[PDB]
Amino acid sequence: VQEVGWHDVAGWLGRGGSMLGTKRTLPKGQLESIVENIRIYGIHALLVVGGFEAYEGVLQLVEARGRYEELCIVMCVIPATISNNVPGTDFSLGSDTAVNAAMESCDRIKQS
Amino acid sequence: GAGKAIGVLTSGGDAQGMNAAVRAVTRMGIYVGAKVFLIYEGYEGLVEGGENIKQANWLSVSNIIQLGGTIIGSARCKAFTTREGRRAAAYNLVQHGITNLCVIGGDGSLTGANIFRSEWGSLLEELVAEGKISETTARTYSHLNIAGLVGSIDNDFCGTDMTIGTDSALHRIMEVIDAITTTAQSHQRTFVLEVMGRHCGYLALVSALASGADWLFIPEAPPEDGWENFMCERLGETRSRGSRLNIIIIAEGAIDRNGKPISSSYVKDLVVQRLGFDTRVTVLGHVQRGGTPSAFDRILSSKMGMEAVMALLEATPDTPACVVTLSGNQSVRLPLMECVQMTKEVQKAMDDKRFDEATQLRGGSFENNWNIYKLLAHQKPPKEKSNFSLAILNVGAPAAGMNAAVRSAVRTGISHGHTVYVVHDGFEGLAKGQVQEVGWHDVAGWLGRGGSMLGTKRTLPKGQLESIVENIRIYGIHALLVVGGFEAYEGVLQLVEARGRYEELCIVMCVIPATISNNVPGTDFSLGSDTAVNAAMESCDRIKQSASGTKRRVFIVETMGGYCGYLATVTGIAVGADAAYVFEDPFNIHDLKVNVEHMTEKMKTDIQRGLVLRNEKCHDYYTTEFLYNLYSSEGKGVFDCRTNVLGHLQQGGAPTPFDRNYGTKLGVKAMLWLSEKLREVYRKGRVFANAPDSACVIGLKKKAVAFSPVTELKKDTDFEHRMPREQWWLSLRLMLKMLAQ
Amino acid sequence: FDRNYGTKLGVKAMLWLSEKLREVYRKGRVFANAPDSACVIGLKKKAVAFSPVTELKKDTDFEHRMPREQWWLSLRLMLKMLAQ
Ligand SMILES: Nc1ncnc2c1ncn2[C@@H]1O[C@H](COP(=O)(O)OP(=O)(O)O)[C@@H](O)[C@H]1O
Ligand SMILES: Nc1ncnc2c1ncn2[C@@H]1O[C@H](COP(=O)(O)OP(=O)(O)O)[C@@H](O)[C@H]1O
Ligand SMILES: Nc1ncnc2c1ncn2[C@@H]1O[C@H](COP(=O)(O)OP(=O)(O)O)[C@@H](O)[C@H]1O
Ligand SMILES: O=P(O)(O)OC[C@H]1O[C@](O)(COP(=O)(O)O)[C@@H](O)[C@@H]1O
Ligand SMILES: O=P(O)(O)OC[C@H]1O[C@](O)(CO)[C@@H](O)[C@@H]1O
C-alpha cells in the first residue's frame, strides 16, 4: 500500500489494461491479513473497481463483518470486466472496447 | 372403532392423579365403542370378583378428577401371587368377558400383571379342564393385552421421565416447607424434614432444589466418610454469614458409603451436639400421598390414560406388554420387561455399592440436577475474576418464577467471576440508568416469592434506544440476559436490528421466556405458566362447586393469555371444561349453537352444571357478554347462566415447585451458554458479537435445551397476533373435545 | 484372494455389527451415539481391526481422496532398483 498524489495518476486515461495490476484472488483465504492491513493503515473505505470477483469479494467482506471488527467499512464496487457479468449494471466499464476488438477481428476473418 | 372390552384397575402405592387416569381411560374407552369394567380394590377385588366389578358409563367417573388418591380402592393383594388366585381372577375376567387389561400402579403390579399375561393361556386351559368355562369362550378370549401406567410418587421407574402423581406430592412438600420456613426464620431454627421416596431420592432432590435446602440426603449420591465435619463447616458458614434459617431434607431411603441407613434422629443428635443450633425434626408422613392433584398431574394422567387405551386397541398378542410413559414432553410407549429389569438392575447395583454404574444407568438428568444444586447451594470462593459485565432485566408482565430465574442467573454469573448488574423496571429503567451492582447475598431468599422483585414493564427499546446506548457505554455492559415475555423477544429483536447503526449494541443477548401465556417462540413451556394453570384450575374448581350447588347453571370464564390459548386449553383439560374457545381454532355461530345444544341435552342428566372457557381475545366480535346472552336466551326454561373474568388471579401467588426448579435450571444453563459465547468472541481485549448466533432464546425443545437465534425465529412468529406460527400443544385440543360427551 | 477376502470380511463385519447392536439396545429402543458405533472393517498389518470412522478423519486427504500415509511406498524402491 502506498499513498497517491494528484500528479501520480496523470495521463493514465489513454492506457489500456490496468496500471495498478489485478488478480482473481478472493479475500477469505487471506482475510486475517486483510484485517491486519486495514488496521495498520486505518482504512475507512474500499472502492473495489473490478469484475465479478470484485462483487464476490465484497460479499465475503460483508459476511466477514460478523466476527471481525475493522471490516465495518464502507465498500463501493465499480463493475469493470469485458464479459459484462457483474450484477446491478447494464453496461460494465470496458466491455465496449472488447466488442470493438471482436468486431474488428471478425471483420478481418470475414474478409478472408 | 371397537367391539371389545377393557379392564381398568389401580394397584400398588396410591398417588394423587389416579382418579384422572381412571376417568380418561373410562371416557376414552366409551368414546371408541368398547366396554369398560371398574375393578374395585385392584387385585384383591379382581380375585374376589362378583360385586367388586361392575360395568361403567360416562357418568360413573364424573366429579372425581379434582380428588386425590383413587375411588376404586387399590387394596394390596397376596393371593394373586399364587396361581390359585390368578386362575380365580382369570375366571372372573372371562365371566365378564375382559380380554384387555389396563393396570395402573408401580413396578411390582406391572411385574405381576406381565406374569399373569404370560400364563393366561395355561390358566384358561386349566379352567376348561375343570369344566368351569367352555372351550368356545376360551378360544374367543385366547389372548390378553396389557398397558401399564406408573402410578407412584417416588418416581423410580426407569423408563419414564415423570410418573403419575409426583408433581402433586412436590406441591404438598412445598406447602409444608413454606409453612415451616416462617417459624424457622422467626426463631432461627434449623429444621429436618423427612420426605418420602422408597429407594429413589428424586422427591428429596427436587424438594431441596426448589426450596434451597442447605443439605440433602439421597441414596443416588450417598454422603462421603466423615461428612459430619463438612456439615459443620457449611452450616456454620451460612448461619454466621446472614442465613437466618436452614433446612435439612432427608429421604427415607438414605444410606452411606457402606450402605448403612442414616436415621433422621442421628441428624438431630449430630446438629445439637456439634453446633447447638436450636432445631427440630419432622416427618411429612402420608400428607404427600393425598390432596387435590396439581394441574400437571391431571393433564398428564389424562393424556397417558388416553394413550394407554389407544395402545390396547392397536396391540396384538405377538406384541409384548408395554407401558406408556414420557420422554421429553411427549407420550412414548416402551416394552414392560425391559423397564422392569432395568429398574431391578439399577436398584441392585445401588445395593451392591456400584453407585457410579447406577448413576449412568438411571439417566444423566439426575446427575446434572445434583451438580446444579451443589453449585448453587453454598458459595465456593471465586478465582477467575473476568472483565465481562452483565445486566439482567425483567420485561413483560410479572409471572411467578421470574425471581427464581433471576436468582440462578446472578449466582451462576458470580460463580464464573462476572460483575453482574440488576436493572429494575426493564428497558424503561435501563434508559433512565437505575443500574446497581449485585452481590451473592443480595438475591438470597427470592426463590419463594411470586411476581418480580426487580419490576417489569411492557416498554420496548426503540423509543429510547439512544439512552440505552448511553447507559451501555457508561456502565460498559457486555451482555444482556433479558428474562421476560413476548416483549422481551421483540425488544431483543429491535436491538439486533439496531446493531447496524450503533457500536455499543454489539453485545451478546440471551432471552429467557417467562410469561403466563406461554407465547414466546422457541420454547415449549415458558417459565411461570405452570403456576398460572394451577391458579386457573383452582378458580374453576371453586366456580364448578358453586355451579353444582345451585343446580342448572353454566359459567362463562374469560381466562387471560393474550391471543395464545395454551392457558385456556390446558386449564380446560385440568378442570374438565365443556369447551375452551381459542383463536387457533376459529369458530362461528354454528359451533356455539351446537355447544348450547350439548348443554341442553346434558342438563337432563344428573350432572346439572356446566363450564365453558374463553381466551380473553379469542374472537374480535363474540364478547363474553354476547355468549352470556346467547346461552341464557337459547337455554331459556332449563337453566340460567353467569359470567366471570379470572383476571390477574391468573398470575398466581407463590410459584409452584416446577416453575421454581425450571427457573433455577434455565438461569444456570443460560448463564453457562452466555459465558461460552461471551469469551468465544473475545478479541483486542473486547467483545464483538455481531453474527445472528449471538442473540438467542434459551428454550426447552422436545428433548432438551436448544439455543435458537433471534433472527432465525423472526420467520416463525406472528408479530401482529403476538404468538409463534406453529405451537406443539394443538394436539391437546383433541383430548379436551373427546373427554366431553 | 478377493473371493476369500470378501467372504471373510462379510462374516466378521456382520459379527461385529450384531455384537454392538445387541450392546446398545436398552429400555426398548436402539440408540447409537458413541463414535465406536461407526467403524471401517479393515485388515491391518497383522489381522482385522475396527477403526472408528470419525477417528480416521485426521489420516485422510479429502482433497485427493487417499490416506495421508500408505504402506506400499516402500515398493517404489523395489521398482527402481530392479530396473537398470
Ligand atoms: N413375583 C410376583 N408375581 C406376581 N405378582 C407379584 C409379584 N410381585 C409382586 N406382585 C404383585 O404386587 C402387588 C402388591 O405388591 P407391591 O410391590 O407392594 O405393589 P407395587 O407394584 O406398587 O410395588 C401384589 O399384590 C402382587 O400381585
Ligand atoms: N450442599 C451439599 N449437600 C450435600 N452434600 C454436599 C453438599 N456440598 C458438598 N457435599 C458433599 O461433600 C463432597 C465434597 O464437598 P465440596 O463442597 O465439593 O468440597 P471440595 O471442593 O473439596 O470437593 C461433595 O462431593 C458432596 O458429596
Ligand atoms: N409441571 C410440569 N409441567 C410440564 N412438564 C413437566 C412438568 N414437570 C416435569 N415436566 C416434564 O418431565 C421432565 C422431567 O424432568 P427431570 O427428570 O426432573 O430432569 P430435568 O429437569 O433436568 O429435565 C421435565 O424435563 C419436563 O419435560
Ligand atoms: O400475555 P402476554 O401478552 O404475553 O403479556 C403478559 C400479560 O399480559 C396480559 O395480557 C395481562 O395484561 P395486563 O397485565 O397489562 O393487564 C397477560 O397475558 C399476561 O398477564
Ligand atoms: O408403607 P406405606 O404405606 O406404603 O408408606 C411408606 C412407603 O409408601 C410408598 O409411597 C410406596 O408407594 C413409599 O414412598 C413409602 O416408603
Swiss-Prot record, chain B:
Substrate binds at S152, I153, D154, R189, M196, G197, R198, E252, R280, H286, V287, Q288, R289. Residues 1-378 are annotated as: N-terminal catalytic PFK domain 1. It holds the Pfam family PFK. It is an enzyme of class 2 (transferase). The modification Phosphoserine is found at S365. Changing T515A: Does not affect GlcNAcylation. The keyword Nuclease does not apply. Mg(2+) binds at D107. CDD domains: Eukaryotic_PFK (cd00764). The modification Phosphotyrosine is found at Y628. GlcNAcylation at Ser-517 by OGT decreases enzyme activity, leading to redirect glucose flux through the oxidative pentose phosphate pathway. Glycosylation is stimulated by both hypoxia and glucose deprivation. ATP binds at G13, R76, C77, G106, D107, G108, S109. Catalyzes the phosphorylation of D-fructose 6-phosphate to fructose 1,6-bisphosphate by ATP, the first committing step of glycolysis. Negatively regulates the phagocyte oxidative burst in response to bacterial infection by controlling cellular NADPH biosynthesis and NADPH oxidase-derived reactive oxygen species. Upon macrophage activation, drives the metabolic switch toward glycolysis, thus preventing glucose turnover that produces NADPH via pentose phosphate pathway. In human PFK exists as a system of 3 types of subunits, PFKM (muscle), PFKL (liver) and PFKP (platelet) isoenzymes. Belongs to the phosphofructokinase type A (PFKA) family. ATP-dependent PFK group I subfamily. Eukaryotic two domain clade 'E' sub-subfamily. This is ATP-dependent 6-phosphofructokinase, liver type. It comes from Homo sapiens.
